[PDB]
Amino acid sequence: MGLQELWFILLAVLFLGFFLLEGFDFGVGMLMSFFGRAAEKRGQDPEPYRRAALNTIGPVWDGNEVWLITAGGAMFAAFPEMYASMFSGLYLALLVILCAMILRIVAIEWRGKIDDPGWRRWADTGIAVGSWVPAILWGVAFASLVRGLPVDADKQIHLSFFGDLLNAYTLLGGLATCALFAFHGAVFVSLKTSGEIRTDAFGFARLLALPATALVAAFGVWTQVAHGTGWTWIVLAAAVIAQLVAVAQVFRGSGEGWAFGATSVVVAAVVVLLFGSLFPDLIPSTLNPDWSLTIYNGSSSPYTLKIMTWAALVFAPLVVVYQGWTYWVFSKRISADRIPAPIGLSRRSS
Amino acid sequence: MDALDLSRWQFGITTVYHFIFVPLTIGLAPLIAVMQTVWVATGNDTWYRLTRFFGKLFLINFAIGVATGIVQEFQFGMNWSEYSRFVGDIFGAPLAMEGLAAFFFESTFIGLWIFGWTRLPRWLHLACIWIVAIAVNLSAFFIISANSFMQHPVGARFNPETGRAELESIFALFTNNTAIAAFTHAVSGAFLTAGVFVACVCAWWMVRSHRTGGESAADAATMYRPATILGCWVTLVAAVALFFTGDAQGKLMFEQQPMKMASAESLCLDGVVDLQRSYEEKFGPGDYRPNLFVTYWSFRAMIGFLAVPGLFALAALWLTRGGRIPDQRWFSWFALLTIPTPFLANSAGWVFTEMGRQPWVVVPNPTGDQDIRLTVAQGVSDHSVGLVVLSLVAFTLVYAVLAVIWFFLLRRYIVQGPSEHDSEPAAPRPPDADDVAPLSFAY
Ligand code: HDD
Ligand code: HEB
Ligand code: HEB
């Protein structure tokens, strides 16, 4: 019933997987610098602690980021008009996001090839940049998409400075997304480590609890009052309850599994609320509420949608299965005094 | 305004950057798979050192391959919006199928191969690299069929009441004449690249080790000579495959795209003017010619850069006939000069293919419906020059710095050699449920 609506739901699920699996990636990237800096204040050296922080997303980060690529491909396959208009309208944001992603990708994997101390500083800076920038720009982009863009007659969104970074409702979205991803990553590292980086992660999460709570609560209320249907009250209540549960669990210091399920619920509820506050259309128009794209004048065709439905309903469950398995395999636990000695070549950075 | 030339330049620069690294990956995954299989079968630890020594280089290349590929996915909608509305209904299916069926597999399983050297059983660890080697060819098939729709389109309708391509058959799209030949030719090129890489590196290390003497003079005959012979045989069979697939693809190009053919065999009757009059009478006014200089010389360079790897392979298979080891200095210089030529030939071929269909971005099929066609002036987005200069400069600079660092790292790790003295026996891989002091890899 309604291949177009089914593919709306499927695109929502792909973006949900991307956000859910890159939340703790961006959180670890934002937090590894503070992990290293908290070890020097005890006298220890910080390199094993930074490596132990980075190693929690070692074997899984690439498969995590493939979700964004496949979401963009699914947009191009199912809703090509939305693809064209959205990516030609948000030109600078995409340019910045891509320049940051390139640096993160290359730094994560070239960091440990040379044993010079100056070679690792640039790798750490690249990881920090590539983790800090998308964590804000994606929230800004999706908040601006839910709020509406100036679609002129058919295409060609041309926005300057007050339609992309409207202080009201758009930078608040980026702030809320950054805070939520930091909390998610902190409580994720608190679950994959074994005894003295675990307490550091608990301290970071106890410092991050309240700001993330307040920010996502304010963003949810603003969204559901300005752009919201009747059944999204339930999603907002679910997000608030889950955040309260996660905060209460973190301030105890022993659960660490329920506190991760709760933050996963919060992220999923935020994504579901943004998409359900938007369902009938894609890229609403602030110029005229008739020049806006919908799933009814933006989809591809019955045949293409049927072929893509077959492909998805065959390949997505298998991907979920074997990625769950690869998360199970590498899930023992990691200590700081278990990272191998640095084995890299001699010197002369570049 | 002038965003057309800037957009063309940007897309060309970025795709050439990507395909500098693509063929090494596509050709080196199966060679490493074979080198690990022959170790798991025979038990000889000589191939363990080789598979580790080349796995390091493979990873160094894979990182920047992914990084350069990440931008091509969004460039279509960023700079070529009007084109993406025209072919989205069809062009989007191979891209999404690629993302769902090959990128997930390769990304998930290379992470298992990197970190599972002492956590997985040996057969599962071998299956990991075999899966990676198959996925890096599946993705090539998908993306090459996607590009082969742009020239000789087959399964489309052009619904006039919406102004769109509209897909009508997926079987006719995935079994296109052009797609099979292009896939075979590109796979042959990638295997040539990887074979030449392995053969030249091992020949350099064989000439170098023989002169050092002492203890390393015995690594030559046991490790560097068999790898050289394997590389040269791979290079020769890939050269023959390239010849035959290229003849087939040229036979195809004669009938379904005559302007490219008339521009390849130019003088330096005329063809390019009679076809000009014919196209001007078919599709109204306009200029329908490629550059006639880049297209003349890219074909020649692409075909002529094959004489260097062939000569090198034929000389290296004769300098090591019975069991002997070469020591000539000029042989090592020859091996060093032979390395960039496969990359140059691949780039030349892809530049000939792309800049030959140049007035078009969707070439009209002579046995199609003649309404599925689009010049590259109705496909570009409507932007200003100041917005495209930003992206062009940024991407060019970032990729140049990353490529310089990549060359530095590859040269450093090749000069270092296989760390045979630095604890390279077959790992024991003890069972789990033990706080082992290292993890065997930690980034
Ligand atoms: C011959 C086949 C082939 C061709 C013509 C291209 N690629 Fe490529 N691409 C590959 C095959 C490939 C690859 C060689 O298999 C890579 C390089 C390193 C790797 O691991 O995969 C890759 C990496 C790669 C990635 C990284 C995804 C991941 O994390 O696994 C993306 C998103 C793309 N490519 C997309 C493109 C687009 C949009 C192209 C059109 C210009 C393109 N590639 C040229
Ligand atoms: C390296 C090499 C290369 C490669 C790999 C490629 C790969 C490709 N490609 Fe190419 N291209 C090219 C070389 C290329 N290419 C160039 C150089 C350019 C720009 C220039 C011109 O065009 O003029 C292009 C451009 C292009 C474009 C834009 C338009 C124009 O024409 O300008 C498109 C769409 C394309 C498609 C494609 C695809 C889909 C792919 C994937 C398969 N391209
Ligand atoms: C390295 C490797 C290589 C080499 C040696 C070469 C040398 C050559 N080649 Fe080349 N190519 C190539 C790789 C190559 N190549 C590529 C990759 C390309 C592009 C892509 C496709 O296929 O399209 C080319 C392009 C090409 C083409 C296309 C055209 C069209 O467009 O259709 C053809 C036909 C060829 C044939 C050839 C031949 C016959 C030869 C001699 C043997 N090529």
Residue numbers in the entry:
A (entry chain B): 1 to 350
B (entry chain A): 1 to 268, 313 to 487
Pull text from the paper.
Cytochromes bd are ubiquitous amongst prokaryotes including many human-pathogenic bacteria. Since cytochrome bd is a key enzyme for the survival of prokaryotes and is absent in mammals, it is a promising therapeutic target for the development of antibacterial agents. Here, we have determined the 2.8 Å structure of Mycobacterium smegmatis cytochrome bd by single-particle cryo-electron microscopy. This bd oxidase consists of two subunits CydA and CydB, that adopt a pseudo two-fold symmetrical arrangement.
In the present study, we have determined a 2.8 Å cryo-electron microscopy (cryo-EM) structure of a dimeric bd oxidase from Mycobacterium smegmatis (Msm). A 2.8 Å resolution structure was determined in lipid nanodiscs using cryo-EM. Thus, we believe that the Msm bd oxidase contains only two core subunits, CydA and CydB. In terms of secondary structure, Msm bd oxidase, CydA, and CydB possess a common fold each consisting of nine transmembrane helices (TMHs). The domains of the two subunits superpose well with a root mean square deviation of 3.6 Å for all the Ca atoms and thus suggest that CydA and CydB evolved by a gene duplication event. The three heme groups (b558, b595, and d) unambiguously identified in Msm bd oxidase are organized in a triangulated arrangement near the periplasmic side of CydA. In the present study, the densities corresponding to the Q-loop without and with aurachin D (a quinone analog inhibiting mycobacterial cytochrome bd) bound are not completely resolved. Noteworthy, in the Msm structure, the channel is also formed by a conserved structural topology and residues according to a comparison between the bd oxidases from E. coli and Msm, which suggests that the oxygen here may also access the active site through this conserved O2-channel (identified as channel 1). Intriguingly, there is an additional accessible channel directly connecting to the protein surface and extending to the heme b595, which is also identified in the G. th enzyme.
